[PDB]
């Protein structure tokens, strides 16, 4: 492990563990090296072989085949008291949260391109039987050269199911009112609610709700000029009743979602 990869600066640490910049020595491939303490691990999973690993590894393996807008797991190691994950690292890259901190509310054309790519990435996860459960700007990376977004940190996720979820460990201000009130939600509609929060976050420069009371009321106020079509999509995603929320298909067929830029166009125009 410590011979295969050369370790660089710490990129960040928190509920996800400690993530380091790194370079695979084999071929000089840029990587991110993520350490997770076993004590601090909340949800565990099992590999097709039967060995017990963090759910994050199970989930990443189910989605890490092929190409997509999900960061790929290259390898993992177990240590006596932690697991170490080796993840692909685009360069240069900036997470969407820092990007929004820098530039404030995003132009709708740019928000459209970004949001579209998040949708495509979430659909891929769902198709692979994976529910992320912590979709937010902190968990999205921007490949600044290619204009491609990448989903990260599946450590709060779960296998997708059609029955009710009664556990949740993701970010509360992104969590749906049915979770706040009843501690029950279903996968796809919970996800759509968090996409509503995210889209609002992009076009307004901050999240719409800070308190349980606001989430439960579900009243959306716009502090920035936002087109009526975008306001409509956001409020649809943020429907109080789960079944009143759009499916992914309905989101991507919405009028506001038409004529999206290609990623490379996006980088050229907006990320120079
Ligand atoms: C000053 N620069 C800021 C942007 N930058 C950078 C590089 C990598 C990351 C990064 C990649 C990455 C990956 Cl692939 C996974 C995870 C994770 N949490 O699983 N985190 C990552 N970070 C922070 C963030 C910022 C390089 C230094």
Curated annotation (Swiss-Prot):
This is Serine/threonine-protein kinase pim-1. The active site is at residue 134. It is an enzyme of class 2 (transferase). GO terms for cellular component: cytoplasm; cytosol; nucleolus; nucleoplasm; nucleus; plasma membrane. It catalyses: L-seryl-[protein] + ATP = O-phospho-L-seryl-[protein] + ADP + H(+); L-threonyl-[protein] + ATP = O-phospho-L-threonyl-[protein] + ADP + H(+). Its cofactor is Mg(2+). Expressed primarily in cells of the hematopoietic and germline lineages. Isoform 1 and isoform 2 are both expressed in prostate cancer cell lines. The keyword Cytoplasm applies. The keyword Coiled coil does not apply. PROSITE patterns: PROTEIN_KINASE_ATP (PS00107), PROTEIN_KINASE_DOM (PS50011), PROTEIN_KINASE_ST (PS00108). Autophosphorylated on both serine/threonine and tyrosine residues. Phosphorylated. Interaction with PPP2CA promotes dephosphorylation. Ubiquitinated, leading to proteasomal degradation. Belongs to the protein kinase superfamily. CAMK Ser/Thr protein kinase family. PIM subfamily. Induction: By interferon-gamma (IFNG). Strongly induced in leukocytes by the JAK/STAT pathway in response to cytokines. Induced by different cellular stresses, heat shock and cytotoxic agents. GO terms for molecular function: ATP binding; manganese ion binding; protein serine kinase activity; protein serine/threonine kinase activator activity; protein serine/threonine kinase activity; ribosomal small subunit binding; transcription factor binding. Changing residue 49 to K: Decreased kinase activity. ATP binds at residues 11-19, 34, 88, 95. Its EC number is 2.7.11.1. Changing residue 35 to Y: Increased kinase activity. Interacts with RP9. Interacts with HSP90AA1, this interaction stabilizes PIM1 protein levels. Interacts (ubiquitinated form) with HSP70 and promotes its proteasomal degradation. Proto-oncogene with serine/threonine kinase activity involved in cell survival and cell proliferation and thus providing a selective advantage in tumorigenesis. Exerts its oncogenic activity through: the regulation of MYC transcriptional activity, the regulation of cell cycle progression and by phosphorylation and inhibition of proapoptotic proteins (BAD, MAP3K5, FOXO3). Phosphorylation of MYC leads to an increase of MYC protein stability and thereby an increase of transcriptional activity. Residues 5-257 form the Protein kinase domain. Keywords: Apoptosis, ATP-binding, Cell cycle, Cell membrane, Cytoplasm, Host-virus interaction, Kinase, Magnesium, Membrane, Metal-binding, Nucleotide-binding, Nucleus, Phosphoprotein, Proto-oncogene, Serine/threonine-protein kinase, Transferase, Ubl conjugation. CDD domains: STKc_PIM1. GO terms for biological process: apoptotic process; cellular detoxification; cellular response to type II interferon; negative regulation of apoptotic process; negative regulation of DNA-binding transcription factor activity; negative regulation of innate immune response; positive regulation of brown fat cell differentiation; positive regulation of cardiac muscle cell proliferation. The modification Phosphoserine is found at residues 65, 228.
């Amino acid at each position: 492990l410590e011979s295969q990869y050369q370790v660089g600066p710490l990129l960040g640490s928190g509920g996800f563990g400690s993530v380091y910049s790194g370079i695979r020595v084999s071929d000089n491939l840029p990587v991110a090296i993520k350490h997770v303490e076993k004590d601090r691990i909340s949800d565990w999973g099992e590999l097709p072989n039967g060995t017990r690993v963090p759910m994050e590894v199970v989930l990443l393996k189910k989605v890490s085949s092929g190409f997509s807008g999900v960061i790929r797991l290259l390898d993992w190691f177990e240590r006596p008291d932690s697991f170490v994950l080796i993840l692909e690292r685009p360069e240069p890259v900036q997470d969407l949260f820092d990007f929004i901190t820098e530039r404030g509310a995003l132009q709708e054309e740019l928000a459209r391109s970004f949001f579209w790519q998040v949708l495509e990435a979430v659909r891929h996860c769902h198709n692979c039987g994976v529910l992320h459960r912590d979709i937010k700007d902190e968990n999205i990376l921007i490949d600044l050269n290619r204009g491609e977004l990448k989903l990260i940190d599946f450590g709060s996720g779960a296998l997708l199911k059609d029955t009710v979820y009664t556990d949740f460990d993701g970010t509360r201000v992104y969590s749906p009112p049915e979770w706040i009130r009843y501690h029950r939600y279903h996968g796809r509609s919970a996800a759509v609610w968090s996409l509503g929060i995210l889209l609002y976050d992009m076009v307004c420069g901050d999240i719409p709700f800070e308190h349980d009371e606001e989430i439960i009321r579900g009243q959306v106020f716009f502090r920035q000029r936002v087109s009526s079509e975008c306001q409509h999509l956001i409020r649809w995603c943020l429907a109080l009743r789960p079944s009143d929320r759009p499916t992914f298909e309905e989101i991507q067929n919405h009028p506001w979602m038409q004529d999206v830029l290609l990623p490379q166009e996006t980088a050229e125009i907006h990320l120079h």
